[PDB]
Design an enzyme around this catalytic site. Structure first.
Site, short mmCIF file in Angstrom:
data_model
loop_
_atom_site.label_atom_id
_atom_site.label_comp_id
_atom_site.label_asym_id
_atom_site.label_seq_id
_atom_site.Cartn_x
_atom_site.Cartn_y
_atom_site.Cartn_z
CG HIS A 28 -1.83 -1.16 1.36
ND1 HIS A 28 -1.38 -2.31 1.97
CD2 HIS A 28 -3.12 -1.38 1.05
CE1 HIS A 28 -2.34 -3.21 1.95
NE2 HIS A 28 -3.42 -2.67 1.38
CG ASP A 33 1.66 -1.11 3.64
OD1 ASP A 33 1.04 -0.88 4.70
OD2 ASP A 33 1.27 -1.90 2.75
CG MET A 63 -0.49 -5.93 -6.81
SD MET A 63 -0.71 -5.33 -5.11
CE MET A 63 -0.84 -6.89 -4.24
CD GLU A 71 -7.68 -8.38 -1.84
OE1 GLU A 71 -6.80 -7.60 -2.25
OE2 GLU A 71 -7.58 -9.08 -0.81
CE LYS A 101 -12.13 -9.21 4.88
NZ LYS A 101 -11.29 -8.35 5.76
CD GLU A 152 -7.10 -12.17 1.53
OE1 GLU A 152 -7.38 -12.37 2.72
OE2 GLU A 152 -6.62 -11.10 1.09
CG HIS A 206 -11.01 -11.65 1.25
ND1 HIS A 206 -10.61 -10.49 0.62
CD2 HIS A 206 -10.46 -11.63 2.48
CE1 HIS A 206 -9.77 -9.84 1.41
NE2 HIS A 206 -9.68 -10.51 2.57
CG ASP A 215 -4.22 -11.01 -2.09
OD1 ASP A 215 -3.28 -10.77 -2.87
OD2 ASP A 215 -4.83 -10.15 -1.43
CG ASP A 239 -9.33 -11.48 6.44
OD1 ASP A 239 -9.27 -12.52 5.75
OD2 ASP A 239 -8.87 -10.38 6.07
CG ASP A 249 -5.42 -11.96 6.45
OD1 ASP A 249 -6.30 -12.42 5.68
OD2 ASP A 249 -5.28 -10.74 6.67
CG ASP A 262 -3.42 -9.99 2.16
OD1 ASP A 262 -2.77 -9.71 3.18
OD2 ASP A 262 -4.51 -9.48 1.83
MN LIG Z 1 -5.90 -9.43 0.34
MN LIG Z 2 -7.86 -11.34 4.37
#
Ligand SMILES: [Mn+2]
Ligand SMILES: [Mn+2]
Ligand SMILES: [Mn+2]
Ligand SMILES: [Mn+2]
Ligand SMILES: [Mn+2]
Ligand SMILES: [Mn+2]
Ligand SMILES: [Mn+2]
Ligand SMILES: [Mn+2]
Lengths: 385, 385, 385, 385
Positions: free
Chosen positions: C52, C55, C86, C179, C181, C215, C218, C243, C253, C255, C285
Site C-alpha cells: 500500500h 506501508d 503489484m 479484490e 471481500k 483472496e 475472503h 492472494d 478474516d 489471514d 496476503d
Molecule cells: Mn488481500
Molecule cells: Mn484477508
C-alpha cells in the site's frame, strides 16, 4: 493402511445403506439387505455395525417378521465375527415425530417415543451393545412460540431419567450417549452442541449413565472446533462414543467420508483420540454420495478407515519426533500442563513475582513459536519431513 | 418508550467509549472521560455502568493515579445515582496476554492474570458490584499443537477455583459470570458457547458461585439460537448476567446496538427474559459504529434501550392476547408443560395407549398450527393486529 | 521444497510487517523497516514484495521524506534482486475513509480517494508494477438506509472508469485487479465475491483493463469454494493476481499462512493454478499470528512458500498418475470437456437418442466413481500411494 | 393488509404442494392436486402460480395423460383468473440428474436435460409465461476431481446459448432467469451467488435474453446481504424475477414463509423493490413447515403476502417521513447520488481541494449520523413513531 477388526471400526446400517434420497432428489441406489452390508463391511476389515430399530426391523413389523429380521442379522454377525457395539432409536423419520419424540408438544407422542426406545434398548442388550445413542433430530423449532425450551428441557430430562430408571431396573450395563446437532431437520435443535449436551447431563438423576456421541460434521455445522469439543468431553469423562465423517463448514449436514471435509481437523482429532487412549468404537456416520453405485459405496467406506489409519500414523510420528518434542517445549506446552498455583492462594497473593515484580514487557516479548510447531505438524501430515 | 433507572439498563464504559479502532482502521473518536460517560448515560435514563479494570484505571497507573481515577468516577456515580452492578478484568488487550490469561502456556502469565483479576474483584466489591464477569477472549488457539485443551481446562478450573476460594476467604457476596465466545480474537476460543461454559461450571469446586454472561452476538457467531441458549441457562439456574447487542449471523463480532441484527431473535429474547422474571441488569455490550460522532454514540445507546422497551411491550401484548392464548393451546404448548409420565415407569410400560393401541397415523395427521401462532407473533411485533 | 525467485512468490510489506494489533489487542511486535522485510524475504527465496502507499511512505509525509523512503526501498530491491509486481492504495485505515473511499457518501472524500490512488499508480509504475489492486474494504454499510447500493455502484464505476482514463492518458501498461471481500470491516462490503466483481467489471467503459485479485480467505468467509471461484475467474480471462492465505470457514478474516485453514482447498487451488498455467505472482496476503516473535514471522512466511511447493508436487503427481488418468475417464471428466451439441440445435431436436429413445434408468444406474477418484486425490496429497 | 391479484403475488405449485419429505423425514401431508392449489391460492388473493414440468405433468406421462393434466390445470386458471407468469424445468429430482443436467459429466444426460427443458419452454409459452427460470441445483460437486469448473462453465454456456437459439428460432418473447444457490443438494453449486450468475450471463451469445432469479434464502446461505445483491441485479438491468422466502442465516435451505428469517432484510428488500419500481411477480418459493396440516399450509401462504404488504406500508412511510428525508440529507445520501467528477479527470487532477488543500481531519470528524437514520427505520418498521 489395511484395517482389521482390532482397529474397532464400525458403521451404521444407514450409512452404506443410504439409498441417496435428499431434499431435492429421489433414491439413486436400491435398498441393501443388512445381511449384505454386514458381509461387505466385514470383507473391508470393519469390526462391527450399528442400527436404528427401523434400519433392522421395518416400522410396523409383526412379531414373526421382527424375529426373522433379527435371526438373519444374527446369522450374518455369526458368519463374519462382526460386533454390534451401539444401537439407537429412529425418533425422526415417521411423521408422528414431526414436532419431536421426547419433547413433542403432544404428550401421547412423548410416551410413544419412550416405549419405542425401551423396546429397542432390550434388543440392543440382546445383540451385545454397550452404548445406546439418542439423536433428538426432531427436538426443536422453526419458530419462537412453538417450543418453550425450559418446558422442553423438563420433558427431555424426564425421558432420559425414565430410560435410566429402566436400564437400572433390568440390571443392564448399557450406557446412553446423547448426540448433539445444531440444526437440520429442525430450524434449531435442542442441545445443539457437545457443551449443551454435557451441561444437560449434569442435571439428570443418574448422570453417570449418560455421555455424549459427538459427530465431526455436527459441531462443524456451528463452525466449532471438533477436536476442542472432544477434548472437553474427554476432560468431563463423557466421550462414550464418537461419530466420524467429513463436513465443509457451515452448511447442511454433508456426512462425507471421514478425512474428507476439514482434513487438518481430522488429523488433530485422531491425534487427540490416540493420545487420550479413547477405547470406544471408531464409528463412521457417513453417506456415500448419491453420485455413487455400490462399488463407490464400498470404496467410500474403505476410505473412511484408510484415512483414519493414515492420520493415526502421521499423528504418532509427529508426537514421537524429537524435533517436535523440542518445539513443544519451545512453545511451553510442558508449562501449560503444570499447575498454576500448587503453592495455594495465600502463597500466590504473597508472591511479588506474580504482580509487583512481574516483568510484563519481558513476558510479552517472548514469542510462542507456534508457527514453527504448526509447520512441523503440516510436514508430518503431508509426509514432507 | 422512555427508559428510567427502574428498567435496570446498564452499559460498559468501553461501549460508548469505543474510539472506533478495528483490524483495518485507526480511531474515529477521541477518548471519553468515564465521568462524561456516566453523566451522558444517566441523562438517557441508564441505571448503571460496568468496567474492565483498565477502562477505569489506565494500565500501569500509580496508587495515587488509581485513587484519583476512582475518586472522580465515584463522584460521577454519586452526582447521577448511577450504579455499578458488574465489573470485569481486561485479560486480552496487553501483549502479555497474547496466548491467554488463565490458560496462557506461560505459568508466570497465568499467575499474573489471577493477581490482576483479584485486585479488580476488591475494587468491584468497593463499588457495589454483585457480578464479576470473565471473558477469556485470549484463551484458545490458531493451531492444533499450540494448546492441549484438556491441560488448558485443568488450568481454567484451577484459576476459577482460586477466585472462588478468594471471594469465600473475604466473605464477599459477589458471584462470577463466565462469558462464552466461539472465536475472535483467537481462531477458536475455549468454552465457545453457553453450553460449554455451563458444562465447565459443573466441574468447579463451588459451582454455586458461577453462572454465565451470554452475549447475543457471541452465540449468533456460531449460528446458534440465542433465546434457546438463554432458556437452557435459565433452566440450569445460571443466568447471572446478560450482554445485549446485535449481530448479522456468522461474521466477526459486530456489537451492533440491541434490536439491530436479528430483530425476531431480539423479540423472542425479551419475551423470555420478561416471562422468566429475569431480575439482573439489562446490560448492553455494543459499539456505536465508527461512522458516528459523539451525537451518534448517544443516539445508538438510546436506541439500545428504546428497542428493548418496544419489544417488551409487543411480547407482553402477544402473551396477553386471548387469540394468542387460544393459538398456544391449539399448538399444545400447554401439553408441552405437562409431565410425560407422572404415573411412573411401570405405569408407562403397562399403558397400551402408549404403544400397542397408539394410533400413530391419527397423531401424525394432527397439525401443530405453528404457522398461525408465528404470524400472530409477527403481527404483534410489527403492530399489525 | 526450497523456493527460489523463479517460483514468483511475493509478499505484502503489511504481511510480515503486521505488528499484531487486532480488535481486542495492542501490538505484539515492533514496526519493521521495509528495507529489513525486503532483505529477510529475499533470504527466504521470495521473488518480490507489494505495498500500500501508506506501508512504504508514512501518511502525511513531506516530498523530501517520500523521496528518502522510496530511495531506501529501491536500494533494498537493487541489493536483493527483489521485484515489485503489484501495488495498491490504503483507502481504509485513515478515519476520513470511515464510510468508504470511492463510494463514501461525502463527495469530497470520493475525490480525495481518487487523487490518493492516482498518486500511488504513478509510483507503482516507477517501481515496475504490472498490477494495481483495489480492495474497497470500507465500501458498504452496517445499516440499510446508510448506503443506496445502486448509487454506490454508480460512484464505484465512475471511480474505476476515471482510473482507466488516467492510465490510458499516461500510456501505462498497468492493469487493475479488484479484490472482493464479503464483510469486515464493514457489516457488508460492496462486490462481496469474485462473481460480483466479475459482473461489475463487464459494466466498466474499458473492461479489458480490469480483472480480479481473489483472496482464499475472503471467498471462504462467504462459505464459497475458492478453487471454483478461481476457475470462473480463469474462464472469464480475469485472474490478473491472487492472494494466498488460510481461513477456517465463516469467521473474521484470519489471514493464516497459506496451507493452513482448508488444506484440501489449498491442494485443489494449486492443482488449478498449475494446470491452467497461471503466470502471475503467487502473492501471500497473510498475518503471522500475534503470538509470534520475528523468528516466528519468518517461519510463517517460509511455510507459505513451502506449503505451495508441497501441494504443487502432490497435484502434479496426482494428474500424472496413470491410475488417476484411468479414474478420470471412469468418472467421465473426458466427456465433461466435449461439446454437448456441436451437431447444432436442429440435430439435437431431431435426435431420438436425446429424448424419445434415451434410457434414463440405464444412465441413472451408471455410478460416477467420484469417491475412488477422490481417495486417489487424498492418497496423493498425503503421500500414501 | 389484504392481497388482491393487482399485488402480483405468485406461488410455485411445489410450495403449498410440498408433502414435507426432508433428508430425515417421510411425508407429513398428502399430495395436492394442482387444481386445488390454484383454487385455494386464488381465494387467498394470489395473482398466479408457477410450475416445474414434473409438478404439473408426472414424469413419464403419456401424451394423453399430459393433455389431461394441462386441460384440468387450464380450467382451474380460467375458473379463477390466475396467471402463470413463470415456469421452470425439474433437472434435479430424477436420479439421471445426480451429477447435473446441463453440466452432467455424461454427455447423453446433458443432451436429455436440454430436450426436457425445450419441451417445457413450449408449454410455458402456451400458458403465457414471460419468464423461464433455471435452477442448476445438481450442477457442482462434493469433491475437487469430479468437476473441472472451466469445462462445466463451457457446457453451461453451450446449454444456455442453445436455449437462446431455440426461443429466437420460434419467435418467443420469453426470457430466461438463472437462479443462483451456493450449495445443497451439491456440496458446492456452480454460479453460487447473484454475482457469479450476472458475470456468467455477460459471456452468453445473446446476454439480453438472460437475467437472474435471486432467492432470499439462497444468498443468505452464503451470509450475503440479499438487498445489496438485488441492488446489483437492478443496477445491471437483470432482475427478471425474484423468489421470496425466509432463512435463518448459514444453514440448510429453510424456505420459511416470507418475513420469517431475517425480518430487517425483508424490510430493506421490499423498500428496494418498491423504490426501484420492480414490475415483475412477487413470487414465493417457500415450504410450509412439515409440522403443519393443510390449514397451516394456507395460513403460511397467506402470511407470505401479509408480511410483504406490512413491510411495503412501513417502507413507504419511512421514505415519505420528512424527518427521515432530513436524516437522509444529514447522512449525505443525496451526495452519494451525485457524480464524483462530472468536471472530468483533468479538472479532478487540477483541483487542489481534492488533495493538497483537502482538510482530511475536518472530513474525518464529520459524523455520518447513520445510527439516528437506522433507529428512524426501526421505529417505522415496528410502528413505534
Ligand atoms: Mn488481500
Ligand atoms: Mn484477508
Ligand atoms: Mn451428520
Ligand atoms: Mn450421527
Ligand atoms: Mn461481542
Ligand atoms: Mn460481551
Ligand atoms: Mn430455497
Ligand atoms: Mn427458488
Amino acid at each position: 493402511y489395511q484395517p482389521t477388526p482390532e482397529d474397532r471400526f464400525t458403521f451404521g446400517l444407514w450409512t452404506v445403506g443410504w439409498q441417496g434420497r435428499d431434499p431435492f432428489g429421489d433414491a439413486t441406489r436400491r435398498a441393501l439387505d443388512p445381511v449384505e452390508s454386514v458381509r461387505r463391511l466385514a470383507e473391508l476389515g470393519a469390526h462391527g455395525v450399528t442400527f436404528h430399530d427401523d434400519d433392522l426391523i421395518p416400522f410396523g413389523s409383526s412379531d414373526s417378521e421382527r424375529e426373522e429380521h433379527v435371526k438373519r442379522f444374527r446369522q450374518a454377525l455369526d458368519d463374519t465375527g462382526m460386533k454390534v457395539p451401539m444401537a439407537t432409536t429412529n425418533l425422526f423419520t415417521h411423521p408422528v415425530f414431526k414436532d419431536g419424540g421426547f419433547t413433542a408438544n403432544d404428550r401421547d407422542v412423548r410416551r410413544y417415543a419412550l416405549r419405542k426406545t425401551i423396546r429397542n434398548i432390550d434388543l440392543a442388550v440382546e445383540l451385545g451393545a454397550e452404548t445406546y445413542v439418542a439423536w433428538g433430530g426432531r427436538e426443536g423449532a422453526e419458530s419462537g412460540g412453538a417450543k418453550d425450551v425450559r418446558d422442553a428441557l423438563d420433558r427431555m430430562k424426564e425421558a432420559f431419567d425414565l430410560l435410566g430408571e429402566y436400564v437400572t431396573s433390568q440390571g443392564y450395563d448399557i450406557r446412553f450417549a446423547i448426540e448433539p446437532k445444531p440444526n437440520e431437520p429442525r430450524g434449531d435443535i435442542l442441545l445443539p452442541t457437545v457443551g449443551h449436551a454435557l451441561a444437560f447431563i449434569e442435571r439428570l438423576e443418574r448422570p453417570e449413565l449418560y455421555g455424549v456421541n459427538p459427530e465431526v460434521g455436527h459441531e462443524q455445522m456451528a463452525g466449532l472446533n471438533f477436536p476442542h469439543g472432544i477434548a472437553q468431553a474427554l476432560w468431563a469423562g463423557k466421550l462414550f462414543h464418537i461419530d466420524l465423517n467429513g463436513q465443509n463448514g457451515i452448511k447442511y449436514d454433508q456426512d462425507l467420508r471421514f478425512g474428507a471435509g476439514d482434513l487438518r481437523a481430522a488429523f488433530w482429532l485422531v491425534d487427540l483420540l490416540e493420545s487420550a487412549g479413547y477405547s470406544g468404537p471408531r464409528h463412521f456416520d457417513f453417506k456415500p454420495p448419491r453420485t455413487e453405485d455400490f462399488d463407490g459405496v464400498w470404496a467410500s467406506a474403505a476410505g473412511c478407515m484408510r484415512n483414519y489409519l493414515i492420520l493415526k500414523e502421521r499423528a504418532a510420528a509427529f508426537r514421537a519426533d524429537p524435533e517436535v518434542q523440542e518445539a513443544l517445549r519451545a512453545s511451553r506446552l510442558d508449562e501449560l500442563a503444570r499447575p498454576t498455583a500448587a503453592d495455594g492462594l495465600q502463597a500466590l497473593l504473597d508472591d511479588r513475582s506474580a504482580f509487583e515484580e512481574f516483568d510484563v514487557d519481558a513476558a510479552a516479548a517472548r514469542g510462542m513459536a507456534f508457527e514453527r510447531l504448526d509447520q512441523l505438524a503440516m510436514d508430518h501430515l503431508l509426509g514432507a519431513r
